[PDB]
RNA sequence: AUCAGACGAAAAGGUGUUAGUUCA
RNA sequence: UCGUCGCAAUGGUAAUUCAACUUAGUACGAGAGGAACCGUUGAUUCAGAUCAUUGGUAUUUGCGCGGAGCUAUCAUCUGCUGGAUAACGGCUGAACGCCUCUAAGCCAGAAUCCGUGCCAGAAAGCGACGAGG
RNA sequence: AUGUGGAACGGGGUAUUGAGAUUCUUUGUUCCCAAGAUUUG
């Protein structure tokens, strides 16, 4: 219901501001970057259904 | 305009709303001041000047629309700054009276002021002359207890701001727009709007 | 669950808790009884059993006997249970002064011991 | 809303299912690691339960 | 409530400036021991336990710059436990912290200083 | 004594504040001095408005317990070369300036009247006789150094202080290359620099100094932190104690000089707060180790009026000058 | 062996192993 | 031999902080509750302190006041910060074709640890530097 | 340690005091003075 401004910001209205195909030879680094994006979009003290909206990597395949 | 400065619903205490300018006090929320600016700030300047370093200077501000005859307890530097900040048409004056909370004492409606029952007649007349509203010496804090404006803010129960006895402190009644606090009751706000022909 | 509640109570009692030996055994029994009573409030038979065990342990003669009595009381209790702020706002901008330079420029306040602003 | 509003919202994150599958596969390793690392009364209780 | 407590003269027997029928309200306890000029504190009526914002403080209250000002007496305007002024109208000077502590108390005050 | 950070408590030998940690430098930073020695002129409270977002006194005038520190422009009269060694930081060679004042030369001599006052006299000889030796020393520093610091002596003569031995402190030039640091010091040899050049007064200066001897009570070097300067008033400036609001000219020195220090004649730095050590003490004003970005550092200083009431003794007026016509004509 | 080894908390747990036996 | 101006082997460590008004009745939450959030104002306790100004001062033995200065937050300052990690959470990925925080590894991440800062310095720790035949 | 020398006075200023007195400073006076022993190098 509250869009997250992207430089992640306004995460469910969060005034705090944090820091889509991603081609890369280093698959481990690309996957690690995807995990960092998922780690950034971390819900705190929120219901799972209420926090169902999040940044999850759709797919990872060779470019 | 039933809006509360930050979480405080004492709009009249925070801001002495008058038709020409809303005598707001410094220390209020910037968004609330902008909200007061959006509601009636364009018609009534809502510059937040803390008279004598008071965030509730609007309660004690005895300056109405025609004249900013606030008490002399207001800071001279702030009053001088406000004189340059606000237009010269408002008869800005320093009411050197023992009752420094003259604005709370005087229900300075733009049509006719209502000074405190124990307020000095000379001080009331001086405030009346600047405000261009005949004073009426008549709780002693007539301005604080009952909101006063030319449009009309009805009277306190003895009530604006969720039944608060200090309607004037809760509701910043002005001739241009009878503002109030966000806590003002819907029936009370509608009655005040009906009294203000709105 | 009953087993989970008993384990939590036992863990809390362990974390919190001849005459000295008898007193220590009685204090441990009383602490366990108080924890069980508090959980039940949030039982009468358990409290009566604990009181009887405390009275029996009050006249204990050996440390082993006190330990056996405490173990029996713990077993009986187990059985019973199982049963903004940085933005700079300038007041000079909101001014009606004819000269913008004058509005943005400060004026003298006091000079040579005399209030210039209050005497001009 | 009212009553089982949370259940109604659930009826109305999808990555949890993928995470659960990853946890289920790692559950066999987690159980062995937890049992081998447990110490004290908790270790005895876990061994007795197993 | 409203406002932030600041270091000032803890003057407020706390004379009940508010027109609650009591001329003086001896401070029984400090709410949240002494209360600064304009700080509400529990006060049992001395002449004529409820909150009492010190509208006037006998002790010199260092101003914003540091200008210490001493009032005639440590007058604590009577305030209801909710926060509003228990009395109909406060008397004498009303401290700026009293306005911050309770706008109604400053509103009830005939003089604000 | 609860904080063992200052326990055990022992008196610091050197009166001058010692920079145990100089600020870190980089080539991007321009070559500049990090420390400047000052004297405790006084610390009277002066009014100043506070323009701070969210301040309860936002845009409100505040009297502030500030501190005036007499700062005679420091003279760089030499350099030291520091080689980075696996056992620590070693002094490669020290290249002094050719000519030295009697005061700094006096520092070396316990008595200075002994026989001949020969401080660096032959050194001054070989300096002029063989400038190439100094060139090689400079070359050795530029070639085999990482940390360049400059020898600096105090101009006590400008200050009203009996002490003649010029306090020498090894201020470190920071920024640029080692050769750039050597070049700046070489071109600045036997030359003085005002603190106004060293510090801009908007900068947050963690002044450090030795606490006074109480009579082990006191006498210990301490490092104040979070002390932004408020006015680096120059000595020639007689408007230094006259801000825009109190435009009337008034010297930083108030009536009755300064308490146990006398009048101020040279540059000074205005800074809020108090610092360890008694009046007229050599105080090490130095760059902040941490680039703290607190709103107090962010907000500028707009000083309302400088208090100039009487120093040692008691004064009820800002300056006698206004008091002359304020009071009736005296018997004289 | 991140509590090596060299000199009961010990029952067990070891997605800790090395060799072998049995059925396969 | 006397000094100058420095490096640091080695220890010790501090600020604990919250509390109350905005930031808030803020997103989210039917709503209540309440984030994120942002400054300010202060304060609990403890540490080093200046002694300017003020209170006290106190043989100025000057004239109760009381200079010159001392003590006293009773005038005032005043107490740091970047990595590595615990649990836990992940990426990579075998063992166990996949899978699997883990096994080789890595990252995030504690009020933890380490350094940084501060206090000292090793009377027998050293370097540069000026001045016995 | 032969000098804008240092120091003491004649003082004065600063303030104290509340018409009077006192005490950091002094282009004044004088004392002091290349001020002697000891210690090592």
Which candidate, F259, F251, F263, F268, places its Cα nearest to that of F307?
Answer: F251
Q: Assess contact for C37 and C43: CB atoms under 8 A.
A: yes
- The secondary structure element, H or E, covering residue F231 is strand F229-231
Beta bridge partners of B70: B94
- The secondary structure element, H or E, covering residue F140 is helix F131-143
Cα–Cα distances in angstroms (integers) from residue C44 to residues C36, C48, C72, in the given order? 10, 6, 18
Which candidate, F101, F103, F90, places its Cα nearest to that of F141?
Answer: F90
Q: Assess contact for E29 and E49: CB atoms under 8 A.
A: yes
Which candidate, B154, B165, B157, places its Cα nearest to that of B194?
Answer: B154
Map tokens 């709780």 to a residue.
Answer: B139
Quick check: B76 contacting C, CB < 8 Å? yes
Beta bridge partners of E98: none
Q: Determine, for residues B84 and C91 on separate chains, whether the beta-carbon distance falls below 8 Å.
A: no
- What residues contact D20, with CB distance under 8 A and at least 6 apart? none
Computed on alpha carbons and rounded to an integer, the radius of gyration of chain A in Å comes to 13
- The secondary structure element, H or E, covering residue F89 is strand F88-96
Nucleotide nearest F260 (Cα, C1'): I24
Q: Assess contact for B163 and B187: CB atoms under 8 A.
A: no
Which candidate, F250, F210, F208, F248, places its Cα nearest to that of F233?
Answer: F250
- The secondary structure element, H or E, covering residue E25 is strand E24-29
Query: Which residues from 76-135 of F have any strand I atom under 7 Å from their CB?
Result: 111, 113-115
Which candidate, F16, F10, F19, places its Cα nearest to that of F219?
Answer: F10
Domain boundaries, chain B: 1-198
Which candidate, F31, F51, F20, places its Cα nearest to that of F177?
Answer: F31
Q: Determine, for residues B101 and E94 on separate chains, whether the beta-carbon distance falls below 8 Å.
A: yes
Q: Determine, for residues C109 and F54 on separate chains, whether the beta-carbon distance falls below 8 Å.
A: no
Helix-strand-coil percent breakdown of chain C, rounded to 5? Answer: 70, 5, 30
- F193 CA, H118 C1': Å apart: 29
Q: Determine, for residues B77 and C109 on separate chains, whether the beta-carbon distance falls below 8 Å.
A: yes
Asked whether strand H has any atom less than 7 Å from the CB of B31, the reply is: yes
* Tokens of residue E83, six digits: 């926060």
- Environment class of residue F226 by beta-carbon count within 10 Å: exposed (0-12), middle (13-18) or buried (19+)? middle
Beta bridge partners of F38: F283
- What residues contact F81, with CB distance under 8 A and at least 6 apart? F91, F92, F93, F94, F95, F140, F141, F144, F145, F148
Q: Assess contact for B23 and B70: CB atoms under 8 A.
A: yes
Map tokens 């400053």 to a residue.
Answer: E106
Residue F172's SS3 state is strand
Q: Determine, for residues B77 and C97 on separate chains, whether the beta-carbon distance falls below 8 Å.
A: no
CA-to-CA distance for B54 and F166, rounded, in angstroms? 53
Q: Assess contact for B18 and B44: CB atoms under 8 A.
A: yes
Asked whether strand I has any atom less than 7 Å from the CB of F262, the reply is: yes
Cα–Cα distances in angstroms (integers) from residue E85 to residues E18, E37, E80, F78, in the given order? 7, 15, 5, 72
Asked whether strand I has any atom less than 7 Å from the CB of F218, the reply is: no
Residue F37: DSSP 8-state: E
Asked whether strand I has any atom less than 7 Å from the CB of F300, the reply is: no
Give phi and psi for D18, each to the nearest 5: -65, -40
Tell me how close the Cα of E59 comes to any Cα of chain B, in angstroms. Answer: 20
Secondary structure of E33-56 in HEC code, one letter for each residue: CCCCCCCCCEEEEEECCECEEEEE
Asked whether strand G has any atom less than 7 Å from the CB of D29, the reply is: yes
Interface test with B, best of E103, E105, E108 (most B CBs within 10 A): E103
CA-to-CA distance for F253 and F233, rounded, in angstroms? 11
- What residues contact E68, with CB distance under 8 A and at least 6 apart? E9, E60, E61, E62
Cα–Cα distances in angstroms (integers) from residue B27 to residues E3, E37, E89, F60, F284, in the given order? 9, 19, 24, 11, 40
Nucleotides of H under 7 A from a protein CB: 2-9, 12-14, 19-30, 35-43, 46-54, 67-71, 75-82, 89-95, 99-103, 105-108, 116-121, 125-131
Record the resolution, in angstroms: 3.0
CA-to-CA distance for B168 and F239, rounded, in angstroms? 50
- F219 CA, H18 C1': Å apart: 34
CA-to-CA distance for F270 and F245, rounded, in angstroms? 17
Contacts of B26 in chain F (CB under 8 A): 58-59
Sign of the CA dihedral with F108 first, then F112, F114, and F115 last: positive
Nucleotides of G under 7 A from a protein CB: 10-16
Tell me how close the Cα of C112 comes to any Cα of chain B, in angstroms. Answer: 18
Instruction: State the distance between the two ends of chain D, measured CA to CA, in whole angstroms.
Output: 43
Quick check: B141 contacting E, CB < 8 Å? yes
Asked whether strand H has any atom less than 7 Å from the CB of F134, the reply is: no
CA-to-CA distance for B171 and B107, rounded, in angstroms? 12
Residue C111's SS3 state is strand
Breaks in chain F (C–N beyond 2.5 Å) sit after 215
Q: Determine, for residues E64 and F45 on separate chains, whether the beta-carbon distance falls below 8 Å.
A: no
Q: Assess contact for F66 and F268: CB atoms under 8 A.
A: no
Q: Assess contact for A17 and A7: CB atoms under 8 A.
A: yes
Residue of chain D with shortest Cα separation from A57: D15
Residue F153's SS3 state is strand
Quick check: A59 contacting D, CB < 8 Å? no
Helix-strand-coil percent breakdown of chain B, rounded to 5? Answer: 35, 10, 60
Map tokens 């089982």 to a residue.
Answer: D4
Q: Determine, for residues E65 and F61 on separate chains, whether the beta-carbon distance falls below 8 Å.
A: yes
Which candidate, E77, E41, E42, places its Cα nearest to that of E56?
Answer: E77
Contacts of C113 in chain F (CB under 8 A): 317-319, 322-323, 326
Q: Assess contact for F183 and F120: CB atoms under 8 A.
A: no
Asked if chain E contacts chain D via 3 or more Cβ pairs within 8 Å, the reply is: no
Q: Residue F8, preceding bond cis, omega within 30 degrees?
A: yes
Asked whether strand H has any atom less than 7 Å from the CB of F268, the reply is: no
- What residues contact B136, with CB distance under 8 A and at least 6 apart? B107, B112, B113, B114, B115
Q: How far is CA E56 from its chain centroid?
A: 6
- F251 CA, H6 C1': Å apart: 39
């Amino acid at each position: 219901h509250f869009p997250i401004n992207i430089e992640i910001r306004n995460f469910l209205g969060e005034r705090i501001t944090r820091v889509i195909i991603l081609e890369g030879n280093s698959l481990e680094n690309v996957s690690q970057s995807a995990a960092n994006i998922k780690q950034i979009c971390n819900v705190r003290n929120k219901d799972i259904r209420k926090f169902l909206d999040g940044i999850y990597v759709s797919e990872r395949g060779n470019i | 305009l039933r809006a509360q400065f930050e979480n405080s619903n004492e709009i009249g205490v925070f801001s002495n709303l008058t038709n020409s300018y809303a005598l707001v006090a410094l220390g209020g929320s910037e968004n609330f001041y902008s909200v007061f600016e959006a509601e009636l700030g364009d018609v009534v300047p809502v510059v937040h000047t803390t008279i004598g370093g008071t965030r509730i200077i609007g309660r004690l501000t005895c300056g109405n629309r025609k004249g900013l005859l606030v008490p002399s307890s207001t800071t001279d530097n702030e009053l001088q700054h406000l004189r340059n900040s606000l237009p010269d048409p408002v008869k800005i004056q320093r009411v050197d009276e023992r009752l420094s909370a003259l604005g709370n004492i005087v229900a300075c409606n733009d049509y006719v002021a209502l000074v405190h029952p124990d307020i000095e007649r000379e001080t009331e007349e001086i405030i009346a002359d600047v405000l261009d509203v005949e004073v009426f010496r008549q709780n002693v804090l007539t301005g604080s207890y009952c909101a006063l404006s030319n449009q009309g803010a009805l009277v306190h129960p003895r009530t604006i701001n969720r039944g608060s006895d200090v309607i004037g402190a809760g509701l910043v009644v002005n001739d241009w727009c009878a503002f109030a606090g966000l806590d003002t009751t819907a029936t009370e706000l509608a009655v005040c709007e009906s009294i203000f022909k709105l | 669950d009953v087993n989970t509640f008993l384990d939590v109570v036992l863990s809390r009692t362990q974390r919190k808790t001849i005459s000295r030996i008898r007193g220590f055994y009685g204090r441990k029994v009383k602490f366990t009884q108080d924890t069980i009573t508090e959980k039940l409030d949030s039982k009468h038979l358990v409290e009566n059993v604990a009181r009887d065990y405390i009275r029996l342990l009050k006249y204990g003669d050996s440390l082993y006997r006190c330990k056996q009595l405490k173990r029996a009381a713990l077993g009986r209790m187990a059985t019973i249970i199982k049963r903004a702020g940085v933005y700079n706002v300038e007041l000079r901008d909101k001014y009606i002064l004819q000269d913008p330079s004058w509005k943005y420029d400060r004026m003298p306040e006091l000079l040579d011991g005399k209030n210039v602003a209050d005497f001009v | 809303p009212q009553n089982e509003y949370i259940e109604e919202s659930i009826r109305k994150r999808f990555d949890h299912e993928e995470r659960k599958r990853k946890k289920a596969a790692r559950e066999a390793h987690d159980a062995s690691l937890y049992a081998q690392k447990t110490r004290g009364i908790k270790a005895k209780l876990y061994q007795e339960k197993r | 409530a409203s406002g932030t407590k600041y270091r000032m003269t803890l003057g407020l027997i706390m004379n009940c400036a508010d027109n609650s029928g009591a001329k003086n309200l001896y401070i029984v306890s400090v709410f949240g021991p002494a209360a600064s000029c304009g700080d509400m504190v529990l006060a049992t009526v001395k002449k004529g336990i409820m909150p009492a914002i010190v509208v006037r403080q006998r002790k010199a209250w260092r101003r914003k710059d540091g200008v210490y000002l001493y009032f005639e007496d440590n007058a604590g305007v009577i305030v209801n436990p909710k926060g509003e002024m228990k009395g109909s109208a406060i008397t004498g000077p009303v401290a700026k912290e009293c306005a911050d502590l309770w706008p109604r108390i400053a509103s009830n005050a005939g003089t604000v200083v | 004594h609860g904080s063992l950070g200052f326990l055990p408590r022992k008196r610091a030998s050197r009166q001058r504040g010692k920079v145990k940690a100089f600020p870190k430098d980089d080539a991007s930073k321009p070559v500049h001095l990090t420390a400047f020695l000052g004297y405790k002129a006084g610390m009277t409270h002066i009014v100043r408005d506070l323009d701070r977002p969210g301040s309860k006194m936002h845009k409100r005038e505040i009297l502030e317990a500030v501190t005036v520190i007499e700062t005679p422009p420091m003279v760089v009269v030499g350099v030291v070369g520091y080689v980075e060694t696996p056992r620590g930081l070693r002094s490669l060679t020290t290249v002094w300036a050719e000519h030295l004042s009697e005061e700094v030369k006096r520092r070396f001599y316990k008595n200075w009247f002994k026989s001949k006052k020969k401080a660096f006299t032959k050194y001054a000889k070989k300096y002029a006789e063989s400038t190439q030796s100094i060139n090689r020393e400079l070359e050795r520093i530029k070639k085999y150094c990482s940390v360049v610091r400059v020898l600096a002596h105090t101009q006590i003569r400008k200050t009203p202080l009996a002490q003649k031995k010029a306090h020498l402190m090894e201020i470190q030039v920071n920024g640029g290359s080692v050769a750039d640091k050597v070049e700046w010091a070489r071109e600045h040899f036997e030359k003085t620099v005002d603190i106004k050049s060293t510090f801009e007064q908007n900068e947050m200066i963690d002044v450090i100094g030795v606490t006074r001897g109480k009579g082990n009570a006191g006498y210990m070097h301490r490092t104040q932190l979070n002390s932004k300067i408020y006015r680096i008033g120059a000595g020639d400036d007689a408007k230094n104690a006259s801000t825009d609001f109190d435009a009337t000219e008034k010297r930083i020195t108030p009536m009755g000089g300064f308490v146990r220090y006398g009048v101020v004649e040279n540059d000074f730095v205005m800074l809020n707060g108090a610092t360890p050590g008694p009046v007229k003490r050599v105080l090490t004003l130095r760059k902040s180790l941490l680039t703290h970005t607190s709103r107090k550092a962010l907000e500028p200083v707009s000083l309302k009026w400088i208090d100039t009431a009487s120093k040692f003794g008691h004064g009820r007026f800002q300056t006698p000058a206004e008091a002359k016509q304020f009071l009736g004509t005296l018997k004289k």
